Amino acid sequence: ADSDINIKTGTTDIGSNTTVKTGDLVTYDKENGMHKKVFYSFIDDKNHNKKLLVIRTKGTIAGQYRVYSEEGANKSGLAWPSAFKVQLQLPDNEVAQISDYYPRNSIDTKEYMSTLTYGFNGNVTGDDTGKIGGLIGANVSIGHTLKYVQPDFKTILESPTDKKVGWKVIFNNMVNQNWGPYDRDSWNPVYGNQLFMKTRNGSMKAADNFLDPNKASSLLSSGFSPDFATVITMDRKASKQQTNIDVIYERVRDDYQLHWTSTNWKGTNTKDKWTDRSSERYKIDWEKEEMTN
Amino acid sequence: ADSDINIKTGTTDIGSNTTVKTGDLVTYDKENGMHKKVFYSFIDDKNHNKKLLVIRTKGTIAGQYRVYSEEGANKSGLAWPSAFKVQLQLPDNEVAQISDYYPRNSIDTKEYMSTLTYGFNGNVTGDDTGKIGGLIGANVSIGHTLKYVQPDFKTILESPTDKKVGWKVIFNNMVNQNWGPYDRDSWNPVYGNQLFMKTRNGSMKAADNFLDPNKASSLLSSGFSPDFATVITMDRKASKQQTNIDVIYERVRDDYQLHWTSTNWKGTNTKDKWTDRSSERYKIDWEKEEMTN
Amino acid sequence: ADSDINIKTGTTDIGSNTTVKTGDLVTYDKENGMHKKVFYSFIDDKNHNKKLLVIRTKGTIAGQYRVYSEEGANKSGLAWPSAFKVQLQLPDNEVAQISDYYPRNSIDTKEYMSTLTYGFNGNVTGDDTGKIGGLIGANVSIGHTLKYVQPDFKTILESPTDKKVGWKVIFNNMVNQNWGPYDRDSWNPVYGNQLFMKTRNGSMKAADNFLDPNKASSLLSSGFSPDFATVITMDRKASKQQTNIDVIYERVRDDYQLHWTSTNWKGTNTKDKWTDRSSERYKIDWEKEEMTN
Amino acid sequence: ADSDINIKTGTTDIGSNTTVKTGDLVTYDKENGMHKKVFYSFIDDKNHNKKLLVIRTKGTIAGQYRVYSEEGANKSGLAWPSAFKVQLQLPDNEVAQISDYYPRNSIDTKEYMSTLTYGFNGNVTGDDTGKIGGLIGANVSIGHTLKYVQPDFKTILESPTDKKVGWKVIFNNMVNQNWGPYDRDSWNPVYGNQLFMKTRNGSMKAADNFLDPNKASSLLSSGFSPDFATVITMDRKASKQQTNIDVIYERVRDDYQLHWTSTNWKGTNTKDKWTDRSSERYKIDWEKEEMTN
Amino acid sequence: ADSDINIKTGTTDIGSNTTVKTGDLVTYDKENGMHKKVFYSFIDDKNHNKKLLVIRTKGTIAGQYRVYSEEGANKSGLAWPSAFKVQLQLPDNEVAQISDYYPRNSIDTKEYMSTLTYGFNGNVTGDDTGKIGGLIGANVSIGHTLKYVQPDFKTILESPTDKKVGWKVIFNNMVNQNWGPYDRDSWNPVYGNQLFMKTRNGSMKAADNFLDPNKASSLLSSGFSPDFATVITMDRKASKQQTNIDVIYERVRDDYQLHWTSTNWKGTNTKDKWTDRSSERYKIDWEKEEMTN
Amino acid sequence: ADSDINIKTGTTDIGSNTTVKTGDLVTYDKENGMHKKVFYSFIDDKNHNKKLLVIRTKGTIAGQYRVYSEEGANKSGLAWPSAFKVQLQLPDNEVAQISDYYPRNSIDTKEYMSTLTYGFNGNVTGDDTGKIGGLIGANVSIGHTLKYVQPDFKTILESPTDKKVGWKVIFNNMVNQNWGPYDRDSWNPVYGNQLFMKTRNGSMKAADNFLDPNKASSLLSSGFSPDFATVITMDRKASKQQTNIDVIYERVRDDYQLHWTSTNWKGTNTKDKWTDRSSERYKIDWEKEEMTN
């Protein structure tokens, strides 16, 4: 921080004595079940070498955990979101550039623990027949414990360039009714993948043996709300002070199938089966300081 | 955050140098046992591209955990709230838009722990008949541990559109007299669903074998108090500057019955049996910055 | 919060540029032993659609944990507070309404954790008689643990309407000399209810076998100090700008009885045996902005 | 802190009453997959003995975890980033100097605990044939437990001079499907280095037996975002008030190979196989207070 | 703190309404590998009975974990820093005094826990030959646990006088590949001191058997960054208003040697084998409020 | 705090609208090796009934842990500091009074936990001879664990009067090379008091058998830095507005002795062997608002 380098907190930050122009752009894609809101801020700090535009991509992409297919009482399929993505793209001819973005990738951590135990014991026996016994034991042990946290979804900043940045919130793993956790590659030779299986044996049909969405992660059904920030810089001396930018919301869905093997239920998951892409273009006016679509 | 992208804190926030007009709208629905309070705020920031209204839905939806039925003394019923809902929606002809909302859906986590243990042990035996023995063992162990938090109720942001937004606080699970936790699906081959039974074999009238609401979640009896926020945006040049909005407060009750099977008590639970809905329309005047009902 | 929906912090709060009139109204009810203190605040924010009065009920209701009955060294009774309550109530004809209140009910949480461990071991044996033995073991064990916090008393907001609000802080459970906990329903075949029992087989007067109040929850003896907030609203156009409001402080006392079964002690707790109520009426002058009793 | 030595907080900090000139310089190296962004701030505090330039190197270095060699289904290679580096350097002919930098090296800690237990036991035995027996044992044990945190990558400030400074984020160790963690020096006589192996003996093309990047540290694939600060001082009376500074962003890649040994997979890791390096020259103007490239 | 004694926070601090004069003095000692930076602040508070100078000694003392010697393939030595020191010294004929300094020595702490547990157990036995067994055991257990943190290095304020102050960051102990930790006095009869030994009986030469510095504390290689503050006071009517102060940066290196005994490796550590001292004199001018070297 | 009693924070604090006169008086007692610094603050708040003097006693009392006597090579003594002290004394004829002081004594706590666990198990046996066995065991276990934190030294406010106040920082207990902790009273019949015993039975001079101070509490060698506050009040109309005050710094030193019993070392410690007193008188002028020595 600024204090770590003996500087007055806030001395190097942008934005002081600047009239900031902000705005809201809301769109709803019915075909793709996506509420998309862009919140923009134009900062023209005369003491800074470039103009800035901070774009915040928010709103919410519905989960859409659905039993889309049912081939009889013995086979049924479920579509579930395995990934949520938001991307911003400036055409390559553009002179404006992506400068900063938030959040970024974090270094994970784990907790390590080692234990060395060693004891001794002595036992003295005997009985009514005047017998007498003994026992002198010894022992050593070495335990290793590893501890770490596992979010249900991971938020990853995808490698940016000066014209493109994007985030993806991917399915990590989940606890199905206290067991598991199970993930996209979970496999049991008997039950197959058990991610969204309600019961392992059941006289019910297939469409009725999928996990209750109220019992799974809330992003799977209700949805995920993005809240990412991208900073775009523009040179004051540039000849074109109008910039096009495409923002793309996206949902990647997997295909989880259940089926009766006559004795038990078997589940299978096909990765990245479908992709719902909601794309849109906005125009940035650096002179009037307003974004439109 | 704004500091993460090297910008002076609060620079991109809306509302500075704006006269804000607020108001309280209170209504009590005696039939539905719902105290409804709407707290609004009109913010016309001239540096923002839109007029804004922040609506905070608060108040209290009574729980109403009650023994409604009494079938002699072998059977009885208990009506309890499995869900609390608050939804806001603009008629599809309206020009105003749902822009933001809070709270949103959270990504859950779990703590993982892998343990690998291995040890050795020697034993030296003997007795008065000069006997001698020995023992040399070796062992291995591989433990796993999953640890997570389980709230009594979950607060979920339902998939929003530019015209509709809602929240659902649903029952998750609950500890009954230091045992469980039980949920709406708990089944005991012999006892059935034990969610609200006081005693398994206790000899009483059915209507007295239900848990004391004082021992269950306080939301079941006294109720839940909403505190949700919606942000609606409006174009300064839209033709009609009046807007209608419907707000609904709901309570979904379940039917938990207790019956004697000569030997013990058998609990049963039937989902979403009854729905209490309290709907109301408010008028938004963007010109006078007022809200009424 | 405001910041979550991109608005300058505090933009939405009431009370800005308003001269607030405050006051204290203290009363001590000697019979019921309740020091009652009302702290009021009138806020007439002109940018708000209604006048506000924030009433804070404080002071302290004495516990009154007392051994009232003494029937010789055989039996004895103990009156202890099982509940403390504070209610506010507007006559039905008043046009002012209860708008908000604090604290409210919170969702409780618990910690769940499953464990799956499995090991293997081999043991070689032998002795002076040249004998040889062996052993190959294997094992598995599935554990589950549940962790949660338990307050000695619970503060519950009772279902509000627009004319009345109230709270009750009720006895939950409590530890007695390192063991238990014990609640109003704890029952043992030998001893009955050991809630306030000093010893199981001590040979004293029944009146000396009750727990030292210094070793029990201090709310039981010294008392509870309420600190609740109720905000009432009033129309600026209303005809009568005068409001009557009743405030009730009450203690619910239980009856704990100890008697000697010749070999040991026996505990018996009779619920809600007694009820102390202290009602007082205040007058609210919305024009002069003052409250009197 | 200033407070610990009885001085008003922030009294000794630089940056007050100075008009600070800031700026961003963005470059994207397509070939190296590195988004580089330099954010600078000139601080000319007249009450400080030198002019200051704070340089924050940010942006992001793509991870590039890649299956580079697919020499059949018996052998394959993976390229992963073992280190990410950012270095700044003033040509030895410069009069300006590196005064400070952030972050720095921290002192690691470790939890230590000792356990000393000892107990006794008695045992009475017998049977139907009137027999009796006994057993009196005792026992002692000493346990030792060491606990510490291990990040996936370590951030290290490399030994600075007044002309060069740099940071390197190196791969520490990592968990592979609940086990390990493994590192660049891991070895199992049977499997070799299992850092990135999906299955120990899975019948697939070698190029399909590598850990899924979504299951590995996100820095490996998506990349790392530097956020380092270095402050350069400059004397107002210096002859040349123009300074050159070279900035190096780099990625060192290791070579991980999976080869099938007719019964199982064997992993091999070759350190520092490749080095990607993007170097740039920036020109500092202490008089006009701007930086260009 | 001020508030603990009913005084307005900050009322007692120095430095208000003072124009503070600060400066940077950077020096790089090439032969000793020390980046030395002094950050000074003159504070002339007219309400304080003295003129103060706060000197902040920062920079970085390179670690220099180097194998300096090699006597063939079975003998080699590694130099490593066991202590890092910073000292300030005013010649005794001077009238300025060391008034305060920070950091200082902290009182350590340790967590202790006792445990008393006891149980009973009964076992019924029998077989097909109608036999009947029995067993009634008992047991007691006394346990003790000690928990505390062990930093790799310790920061100690050396006993100061009014003309001298100094700190020493000294090596405590370190974890070598999950085992240990080992300190400068660790002694194993077969392996000697295993502090930086890579393998116990590897096949390489001596210079190839030392621990990778990337797997050791980063202070050993990259070095330590000092951040210590000294406060010096001067009387305004002292005749001599010039002061010379010497500041010394120091590194104490130990000698760790490895030797192959043809059966295994054996380590050795000789303490304080070398001392790298870097001194410098600065002239403090209290009249001009300037510091130079 | 103020907010608990509905009063604006800081409303009842002293210091408002006052010009505070501060100062430093540094002394270095060479013989007792004590760096003494007195930081004063005169606060004449006109709305407060008395003038105020806040004396802060800082500086450092050297530890001086050293081998004072080598009585051969099997007899040696060690002088270590058992207590550090700071006292302030107003002569009895003074009218000024000691009003407040900081820090004060705090109530300690400890964690307690009662465990109750029982189980049941059955085992079926057999063999090749067709023989069958059985086993049905049951158990119970009551555990009790106590846990608390214990500092190496306790800082204690000695009982003050209106004319004197003091603090004593006394040695509590300490971990010696991972075992212990030992205190001034530790007694083992085989080795006596093992507090500073390096080895239990090594072959060196006794003086080479004391714990490395680098491995013991830093307070013992480098010293303790006091930071105690004393608030002195004075009537504005007191006859003489001058005041004398004595300030004493102390170090009590114990005697730790080691003697070889030709099998093992035996340690022994005699309490409060020496006392080092460093006293000083200061004059307080309430008219001029300055303090001298």
Side-chain angles (χ1 to χ4, degrees), chain E residues 114-151:
Chain E
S114 300
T115 308
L116 180 277
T117 147
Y118 53 84
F120 307 101
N121 58 296
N123 311 78
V124 163
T125 17
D127 55 29
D128 55 354
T129 80
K131 195 79 177 86
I132 290 290
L135 179 40
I136 305 174
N139 59 86
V140 166
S141 192
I142 291 294
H144 309 284
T145 310
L146 190 69
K147 189 191 89 74
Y148 49 100
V149 194
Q150 300 169 140

Side-chain angles (χ1 to χ4, degrees), chain E residues 63-80:
Chain E
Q64 304 186 158
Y65 176 96
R66 283 150 160 58
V67 330
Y68 72 105
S69 160
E70 204 177 334
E71 174 108 87
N74 293 144
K75 192 135 50 177
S76 199
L78 163 75
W80 65 282

Side-chain angles (χ1 to χ4, degrees), chain E residues 182-195 197 200 256 259 264-268:
Chain E
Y182 297 97
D183 50 54
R184 308 204 292 162
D185 299 302
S186 291
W187 199 258
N188 178 313
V190 181
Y191 302 113
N193 193 322
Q194 299 170 248
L195 232 197
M197 186 183 293
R200 298 165 110 137
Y256 180 74
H259 86 260
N264 55 289
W265 283 108
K266 200 195 170 68
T268 258

Side-chain angles (χ1 to χ4, degrees), chain F residues 208-226:
Chain F
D208 282 48
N209 199 40
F210 292 116
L211 186 58
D212 181 5
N214 276 351
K215 275 205 257 285
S217 175
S218 48
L219 267 71
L220 290 163
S221 54
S222 302
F224 169 71
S225 300

Side-chain angles (χ1 to χ4, degrees), chain A residues 2 4 8 12 47-50 98-101 108 110 112 114 116 118 120 127-128 148 154 159, chain D residues 14 22-24 35 37 56 58 60 104 131-132 138 140 142 144 146 148 150 152 173 178 214 222:
Chain A
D2 308 303
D4 299 296
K8 184 217 225 172
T12 65
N47 286 319
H48 188 75
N49 79 336
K50 309 268 180 60
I98 287 169
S99 173
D100 214 348
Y101 23 73
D108 293 291
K110 73 200 74 62
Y112 190 82
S114 292
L116 161 69
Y118 55 84
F120 324 100
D127 58 26
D128 68 53
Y148 56 106
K154 281 181 177 181
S159 302
Chain D
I14 300 163
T22 58
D24 285 296
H35 177 244
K37 168 250 186 63
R56 295 188 155 87
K58 306 182 71 178
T60 133
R104 289 148 209 149
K131 182 100 195 87
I132 297 298
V140 173
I142 316 298
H144 302 294
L146 177 71
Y148 50 88
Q150 324 184 99
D152 283 5
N173 60 31
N178 299 329
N214 287 0
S222 294

Side-chain angles (χ1 to χ4, degrees), chain C residues 45-59:
Chain C
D45 192 330
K46 293 298 158 62
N47 292 314
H48 193 59
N49 78 336
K50 283 166 190 205
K51 284 166 170 171
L52 299 201
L53 163 67
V54 183
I55 301 183
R56 280 187 175 65
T57 56
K58 308 182 70 172

Side-chain angles (χ1 to χ4, degrees), chain B residues 8 37 57 73 86 113 141-142 159 211 232 237 265 286:
Chain B
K8 180 193 172 190
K37 172 257 196 64
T57 45
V86 172
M113 195 152 152
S141 263
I142 303 152
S159 296
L211 201 55
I232 287 105
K237 289 205 70 63
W265 283 108
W286 297 98

Side-chain angles (χ1 to χ4, degrees), chain B residues 52-102:
Chain B
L52 310 188
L53 165 65
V54 180
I55 298 169
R56 289 187 171 71
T57 45
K58 306 180 68 179
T60 309
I61 301 164
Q64 295 187 153
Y65 171 96
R66 308 160 323 115
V67 171
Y68 69 111
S69 167
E70 195 250 44
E71 303 294 355
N74 295 148
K75 177 177 279 300
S76 184
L78 173 82
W80 62 284
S82 51
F84 293 103
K85 310 191 184 177
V86 172
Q87 324 172 325
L88 302 94
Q89 63 150 29
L90 298 166
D92 243 336
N93 55 272
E94 298 298 341
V95 180
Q97 302 179 284
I98 283 186
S99 171
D100 213 339
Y101 23 75
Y102 188 72

